[PDB]
């Protein structure tokens, strides 16, 4: 009756407590065998570190930065180095059942952009300054057009140089 139901609780609590003791003993040996592996493997890593001799980081010298401290220590100010921007690569992709499809100087022009990248005054000064090297005279205008295509093609820049020098 009620007495058997109490021994069921009794014997069940005992059987589970035993199996708790059984597994507790297991994880203790799992932890102890495991630390031996950590001990030897970290020693391998450490013995490799004692071979290397890596150089120490130094503070070796208009934007700055500051770090403040709650304690006796003074405010520290050092210059803020700006990390070079990462280049976005202009990927273009074409798909058809048949096929698929896919320097320094021009970023020089873009970022200190305050005509088409070069004005008439500097363009004429440029043509004149290049006449020293060399009998084509066309190779000059083809090169200026190559690097400054926004101002015109080779034959266009030749016409404009003559316009501006009259």
């Amino acid at each position: 009756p009620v007495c058997w139901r109490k021994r069921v609780k009794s014997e069940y609590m005992r059987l589970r407590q035993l199996k708790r003791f059984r597994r507790a003993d297991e994880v203790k040996s799992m932890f102890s065998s495991n630390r031996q592996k950590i001990l030897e493997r970290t020693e391998i890593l450490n013995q490799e570190w004692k071979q290397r001799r890596i150089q120490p980081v130094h503070i070796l010298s208009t934007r700055e930065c500051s770090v403040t401290s709650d304690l006796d220590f003074p405010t520290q100010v050092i210059p803020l180095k700006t990390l070079n921007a990462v280049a976005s690569v202009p990927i273009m992709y074409s798909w058809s059942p048949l096929q698929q499809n896919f320097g320094t100087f021009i970023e020089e022009l873009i970022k200190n952009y305050d005509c088409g990248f070069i004005n008439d005054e500097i363009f004429v000064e440029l043509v004149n300054a290049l006449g020293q090297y060399n009998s084509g005279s066309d190779k000059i205008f083809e090169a200026i057009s190559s690097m400054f295509p926004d101002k015109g093609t080779a034959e266009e820049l030749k016409e404009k140089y003559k316009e501006l020098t009259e």
Partner: protein
């Protein structure tokens, strides 16, 4: 059952941007006798500090990304085999990896290609050139930063099905354990002949390159946590991992008797050894730390308290932890870092504050 390690707060700093600092890493590659230095990442800023006597933390170097919307989440130290220079890898919301050289103070390498933001960077414990980046795109990727090649992509038809939040190499660098927002923890071996030949051909490459996609992990489980897993670390052949349920679970694949290197991928069994219990750390992206010798485990909570466990006691999961607290430290601690000799413990917070704890 007091914890035998005890610390004293000897300094508290604060960077000028007042933005959350998500990562802190001591430079463990520093040679004996050189001062202990560490790096913090937060906002679009990177900052290197030097620890000195009597709690003094010298400000050494600082960098800002040109992109005002970049937000670095993690950093990792390595070194150059040839030049003996230490190197620092940083990454975050825009999913690009930068390698900063503090000796020359310039950014020497970009690695762009991840689908999305990078939540963790880790360097191979035996090969300084092997970098691991886990991302929002559900994948992991192994880079060779000597030849600038992608060695392998971990993920695909049986990889993670949501963001990957953390990963960790084992001590000898033979396997990787990763976790993420899909409740899963997956084991990727890199000592397989397929991976070792991919690492070798990455090295023997000269342009004068196909990266191998690993679709299947060597183990995987969702039966450890009931929510996102946001931090995983190896403890020998055992694993420590945590979620928002206010406990770090110590577990191992297979059953109690099963060897880690005999686990074959079909394994459906796991074994929970114990749990490191704490409180008030239920927000996401809160990462726990260990010293080099793996004798201490540290984790901060969202209201400024810092828990430190002694992992070398008989019952580590059943032992009281040291609770480091300070009256003026009430911001969520995002990451901790032990010096290599574990004499100093640094915590960084959501209010751009840095806390220095010296061991006694």
């Amino acid at each position: 059952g007091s914890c035998k390690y005890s610390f004293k707060c000897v300094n508290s700093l604060k960077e000028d941007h007042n933005q959350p600092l998500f990562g802190v890493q001591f430079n463990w590659h520093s040679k004996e006798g050189d001062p202990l230095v560490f790096a913090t990442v937060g906002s679009n800023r990177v900052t290197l500090y030097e620890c000195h006597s009597q709690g003094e933390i010298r400000l050494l170097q600082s960098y800002v990304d040109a992109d005002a919307d970049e937000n670095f989440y993690t950093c990792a130290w390595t070194y150059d085999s040839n030049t003996s220079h230490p190197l620092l890898a940083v990454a975050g919301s825009r999913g690009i990896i930068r390698i900063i050289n503090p000796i020359t103070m310039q950014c020497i390498k970009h690695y762009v290609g991840h689908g999305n933001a990078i939540n963790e960077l880790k360097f191979h414990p035996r090969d300084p050139n092997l970098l691991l980046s886990v991302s929002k795109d559900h994948a992991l990727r192994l880079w060779n930063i000597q030849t600038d090649t992608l060695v392998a992509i971990f993920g695909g038809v049986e990889g993670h099905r949501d963001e990957v939040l953390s990963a960790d190499y084992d001590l000898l660098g033979e396997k990787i354990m990763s976790c993420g927002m899909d409740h899963s923890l997956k084991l990727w071996r890199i000592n397989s002949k397929r991976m070792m030949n991919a690492i070798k051909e990455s090295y023997d490459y000269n342009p004068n390159f196909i990266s191998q996609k690993i679709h299947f992990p060597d183990f995987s489980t969702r039966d450890i946590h009931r929510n996102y897993v946001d931090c995983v670390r190896w403890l020998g052949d055992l694993i420590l991992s945590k979620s928002c349920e206010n406990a770090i679970v110590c577990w191992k694949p297979g059953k109690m008797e099963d060897d880690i290197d005999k686990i074959k991928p079909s394994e459906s069994n796991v074994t929970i050894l114990g749990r490191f219990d704490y409180s008030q750390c239920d927000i996401w992206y809160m990462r726990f730390s260990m010293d080099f010798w793996q004798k201490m485990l540290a984790l901060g909570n969202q209201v400024g308290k810092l828990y430190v466990w002694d992992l070398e006691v008989e019952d580590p999961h059943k032992a009281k932890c040291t609770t480091l607290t300070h009256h003026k430290c009430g911001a969520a601690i995002r990451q901790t870092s032990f010096s290599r000799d574990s004499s100093i413990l640094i915590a960084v917070c959501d209010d751009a504050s840095i806390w220095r704890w010296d061991r006694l």
